[PDB]
Amino acid sequence: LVHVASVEKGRSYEDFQKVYNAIALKLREDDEYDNYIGYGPVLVRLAWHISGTWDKHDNTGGSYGGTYRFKKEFNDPSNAGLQNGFKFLEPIHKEFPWISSGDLFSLGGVTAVQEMQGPKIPWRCGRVDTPEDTTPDNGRLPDADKDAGYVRTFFQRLNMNDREVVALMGAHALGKTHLKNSGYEGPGGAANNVFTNEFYLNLLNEDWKLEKNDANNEQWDSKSGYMMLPTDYSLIQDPKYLSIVKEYANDQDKFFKDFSKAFEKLLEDGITFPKDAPSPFIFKTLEEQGL
Ligand code: HEM
């Protein structure tokens, strides 16, 4: 496969900035979801799960085809709970029927991070919806019950190296795990709907205790009321990953700069951009626009 980026016919920066402004205004408004966490966390988890099916060996999966819209990917056990992020974005797709599904699912993630006080993420338009038979089979998304060796081997299929993997995993400060979705339960820190380096600081400063939860799965619990997954806890058990965790814990700006670069790379894997294509757009936040 080659997947060439094609701009939605006739659309420019200001059209996309209107879809972003509409996702951000609805984030402001539906602030009660999941005990007042808001939809920001499930929207960046939707943007990474539609991108994480990519396989570098044959160019299949990835964000291009917007295939989550199909039953097979939608009903994938690893995608339980993302139906909430889909339902949120659906009125917005009726308001802007011209934007592709992959472009909308991925911009939902960019909007959520920037509106949660994260770094600016450059975003590129051009994904094209593809047929139901291009939909990737289930089982390409990662297990939580595993170690640092599995994590490194997994992220190599998306050719993400160590620093990219540690920066990307910093998004687990956001939101929480839910027992009925994944068999895990609990938050990862205090500020779980503001984007900060808190995941790293909690992983270095809490007194973590291994326990089984109500689903019979193990997780790392702390006195404070926080939890970490086995794969999260892996980042301080591996010596290469641990020097990077310490770097981000001492420097949130370096974390922002590296998360920005890696999240964009994750959203654009498997897509060729012609050089006639527009440069990546930097969207303004509501606040920047006075809205
Ligand atoms: C080895 C990698 C990863 C594994 C095994 C993993 C696993 C999980 C699991 C089990 C949950 C809880 C789901 C639930 O019960 O609702 C979760 C939540 C979440 N994940 Fe990951 N994750 C990984 C990588 C990432 C990456 C790379 C991102 C983002 C760049 C990400 C973002 C999120 C977000 C934001 C949540 C919170 C969702 C919410 O509050 O509803 N994860 N993850």
Curated annotation (Swiss-Prot):
Keywords from the named record? Heme, Hydrogen peroxide, Iron, Metal-binding, Mitochondrion, Organic radical, Oxidoreductase, Peroxidase, Phosphoprotein, Transit peptide
Q: Which GO terms describe its biological process?
A: cellular response to oxidative stress; hydrogen peroxide catabolic process; response to reactive oxygen species
Give the function comment from the record.
Destroys radicals which are normally produced within the cells and which are toxic to biological systems.
- Tell me the residue numbers annotated for binding heme b: H172
Site entry (Transition state stabilizer), positions: R45
Q: Where is the active site?
A: H49, G188
What is the protein's name according to its record? Cytochrome c peroxidase, mitochondrial
Q: How is it modified after translation?
A: CCP1 precursor is processed by the rhomboid protease PCP1, which cleaves the N-terminal hydrophobic transit peptide. The m-AAA protease (composed of YTA12/RCA1 and YTA10/AFG3) is required for CCP1 maturation: m-AAA protease promotes membrane dislocation of the CCP1 transmembrane segment within the transit peptide to ensure the correct positioning of CCP1 within the membrane bilayer, allowing intramembrane cleavage by PCP1.
Q: Which reaction does it catalyse?
A: 2 Fe(II)-[cytochrome c] + H2O2 + 2 H(+) = 2 Fe(III)-[cytochrome c] + 2 H2O
Where is it predominantly found? Answer: mitochondrion
Q: Needs which cofactor?
A: heme b
Name the EC number(s).
1.11.1.5
- Tell me the residues on which Phosphotyrosine occurs: Y150
**Could you say which residues of the full protein are shown?**
71 to 361 of 361
In terms of domain of life, where is this protein from? Eukaryota
Q: Molecular function (GO) terms listed?
A: cytochrome-c peroxidase activity; heme binding; metal ion binding; peroxidase activity
State how it assembles: Forms a one-to-one complex with cytochrome c.
- Coiled coil ranges: none
Note on file? Present with 6730 molecules/cell in log phase SD medium.
**What are the subcellular locations of this protein?**
Mitochondrion matrix; Mitochondrion intermembrane space
Q: Which GO terms describe its cellular component?
A: mitochondrial intermembrane space; mitochondrial matrix; mitochondrion
